[PDB]
Amino acid sequence: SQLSPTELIEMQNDLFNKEKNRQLSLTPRTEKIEVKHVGKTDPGTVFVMNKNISTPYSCAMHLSEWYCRKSILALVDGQPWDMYKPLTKSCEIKFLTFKDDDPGEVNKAYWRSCAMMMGCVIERAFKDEYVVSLVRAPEVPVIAGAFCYDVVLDKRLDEWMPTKENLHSFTKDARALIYKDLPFETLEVEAKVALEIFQHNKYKLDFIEEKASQNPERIVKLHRFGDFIDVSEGPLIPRTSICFQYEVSAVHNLQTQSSLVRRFQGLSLPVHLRAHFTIWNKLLERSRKMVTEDK
Amino acid sequence: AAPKNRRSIEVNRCRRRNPQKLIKVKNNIDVCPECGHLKQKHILCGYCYEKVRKETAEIRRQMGKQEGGPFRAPTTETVVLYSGETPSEQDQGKRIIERERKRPSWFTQN
Amino acid sequence: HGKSVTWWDEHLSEENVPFVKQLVSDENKAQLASKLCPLKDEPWPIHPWEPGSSRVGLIALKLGMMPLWTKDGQKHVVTLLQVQDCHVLKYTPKENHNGRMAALTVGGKTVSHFHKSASILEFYQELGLPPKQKVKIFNVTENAVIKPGTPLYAAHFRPGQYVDVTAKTIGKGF
Amino acid sequence: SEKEFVEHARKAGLVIPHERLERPIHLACTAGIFDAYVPPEGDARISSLSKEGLAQRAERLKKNVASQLSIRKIRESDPNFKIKDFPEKAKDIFIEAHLCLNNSDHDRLHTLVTENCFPDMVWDIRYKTVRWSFVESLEPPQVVQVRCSSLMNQGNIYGQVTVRMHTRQTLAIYDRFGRLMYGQEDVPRDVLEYVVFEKHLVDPYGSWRMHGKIIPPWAPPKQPILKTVMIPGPQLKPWEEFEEPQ
Amino acid sequence: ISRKWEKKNKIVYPPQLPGEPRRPAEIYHCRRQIKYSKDKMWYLAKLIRGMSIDQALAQLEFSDKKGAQIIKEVLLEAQDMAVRDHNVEFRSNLYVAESTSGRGQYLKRIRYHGRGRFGIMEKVFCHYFVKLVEGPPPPREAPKTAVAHAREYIQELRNRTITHAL
Amino acid sequence: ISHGRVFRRLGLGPESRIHLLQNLLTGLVRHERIEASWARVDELRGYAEKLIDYGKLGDTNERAMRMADFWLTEKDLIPKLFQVLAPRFQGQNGGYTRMLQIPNRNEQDRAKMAVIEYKGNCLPPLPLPRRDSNLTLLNQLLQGLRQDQEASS
Ligand SMILES: [Mg+2]
Ligand SMILES: [Mg+2]
Ligand SMILES: [Mg+2]
Ligand SMILES: [Mg+2]
């Protein structure tokens, strides 16, 4: 198909908004749900929220600004939940921060979110004369050097390793994305509709089908911030501006008998947990090394 | 010495609102992880310490009733036991303080 | 964004505070010991002495005082000045500093990385040396230029020479 | 130098001043309701039946002994009183009383509603803006029961009439800043009420005044509010620990 | 005496037509006859201008001034009015739009020095005024950049006309 | 010019300085946890550290008994020092007491308070500032360096 980069982004935004309106129209009347706060700090608090339009961030706004800024992931019952995905049914809520003794759930979400930011920067950095295909964001533990994102480039761009300036160019663009405040939007979209969003990308269609096989309902999760739409597993941090230190470490080559995937690795730290300059440089060097963990 | 002329309000406003004389903001305010109240980074929580101080007063009040004299002090170690507990083998040979309330969560038995 | 103040030890766990101290300490010894070959790391050319030439001074630490006696029986008091860590930091061309003599920069004793500015730490990272306490500017002629990063020792001064001393005096307040 | 402050306001009451009133306080209407009518739980479904609802309500009027005695008491105290014409007068009073709140006219409302009913419909909406309208009446009003009380202290007799009305209304409450608060404007919601009226019989004037509003216990819950509320948790003193009821 | 700040809460605006921008809430509250002085109270009021209610309370929590506790009580009781008397949800979504300190009624006394002399002593009373507006706090203005100064100066040189020309 | 002066001027002079610390030290021994002004508590820490050192000397040493006689103004605390505090502290050398900054006193003076206590006291623990757990995001990244460093070296 003959679609310019501006048009294909506009088409996806139109499709995503159309799906969002359909979900809102499925609830004709505002329904009141009673949410009991089971957090350690303020037990016994009962919230009376609206169905499918009230997010846990709006739930946190009732308490104080401290819950608005410290909280990252909300715990609906026993399931992790984003702070911008609207609630569905009456349940119990708990807020998890970095300072908690078990930030493992929050650490995984932050690592996933930073990978998505790199994909947006990589996709909209190459010239339109080259084709960029985003494959996926492999799940690597935080104990590893850094988060990695897999990108397939053009065939005529096979013999090209980015230079130091080119690697730093991605970081500057990422920081510009950090400078503007863009919330993360989570939407549940049916599998066939998701295939329409990523029609151009062959690899994304395969990723959607694989994810849809794990759920009997053929339901997938889509996350959008700004004008970029991507499919990812698990929740994400509520706000883009949570990241403070961001850097693209280096690239690596993984050659398969069918295609070549470029592995972009970068290391980031949040505002709350920013480190010293001496410690940051030590951690940055370890991020240069190859990361190999898929299954 | 005495002033020569009345200070104009224009001069007074400059002096009374100088950045030095203004109140400086504090950027070291944090929420206490245990109780969720406010405290500074280098200062113990006011609410949590007040919780401990009230309990400490009750324990000391019980000790006073166990030593009537003003110059009576134990020659051995002291162990505090709450309701539903009995002294251990390592705790024998020490004075026992009994409290009716249930053992608080923050207090840890050894 | 009212970002809260932070320090290096704020977010470090008890199991990592000793590790970080070990990590920085080992880097200092490796960096200092790698500069101990000034004439084996391609130094700048050395020119013969000429009249009116000026040499490079040092930065030392004042230990204390001792009495000293000469062969004629007189008594003198000497001050013990120790050179702990002295390295030339940067070289300024003749026409960019004064227009008559070049400037050579000399650092002080080693200090901790965790209490210096971002620019100061970044400057030393490029050179590959631990941060210094005090930095002074020396006026040196073009025939006595030293490649930055060359260590200096107390043997730079031979006995029998007359030297100057510049330092902040004892502050007695108001 | 010897100047001090005055005007400290406090409200103190004692039994002695209340018992020394030269003229006793005159009450236009009684405070409470003598008896609360208990409608059957099936009225939500009988209301859709025309013949069954009218016939059953008619029998209840003609079979109650106490109600018929009260009706005769009103007739003896004041002639030219008809039960049949009462609901039409009651229906018009109900419409006029609420339209007064729309226009915020308290002078007319005092004649329509009684002393015990005025604070309930005025206190909460004092600084707000409400818009109430009447569109349709699906079922004509019927008289439920009539009761009377004889206070031998002064011989005052009050006649309470309970009327069941099925009303179609459009309620919308606006915030003092002009933003919508409770309901929309174009939705004709169906509502059922048991309005209790009251008239002073000894008084030669004796206007018919609305006394109270009875809501059945099984009535459907009202439409949800637009604003989100939070119930605060139990305030805890430092020496008290939280306990979770189950 | 004058009491007009209290009466600002009784203003009823006409209902807004659909499609108009949402009107932010405005809450007026004050306390009369505070024993604290007028000038000392002003510094506390200047501190909390333009900040959200949650961080305004945090700053006044640890302030050592006697009036810090007085102002914190005023803000807390004004917040309850906003969420109950007014239809303001998200009790943390308020910012202090305006705060100031006025002077109350003084009591005159006699202060003794010696040699039979005296001086008039003025017992000091002050008022506190606070206005809370629903919404995030406005962003503080940054200093003019280098381009901003150059643009104004070039514009100024372009406005020049021949004085007493014709 | 106060160069090199490690002591502080308290009370009505050098003699009143000792007596003020004499009463505080007596309260610290009997109760094992007292709170006072931060400046006065800081001075009291030095004496409390060395008083235990005199206790370790023994009940028979004459100098220790005379030194404890002056500081323990209440005479029923001397047996406690040589039979409770001293036997308890045998392992550590200088970690006898803790000092933490209590928030300012809720009074007019608004003094800077501090809490001083002995190790292993029979009282509820103070809310000590707990460090971040090793599971934090920053700690996890640093632990990766340690595992890799120990794997090669
Ligand atoms: Mg000095
Ligand atoms: Mg006299
Ligand atoms: Mg005068
Ligand atoms: Mg005066």
Ligand SMILES: [Mg+2]
């Ligand atoms: Mg000193």
Ligand SMILES: [Mg+2]
């Ligand atoms: Mg003094």
Ligand SMILES: [Mg+2]
């Ligand atoms: Mg000290």
Ligand SMILES: [Zn+2]
């Ligand atoms: Zn606390």
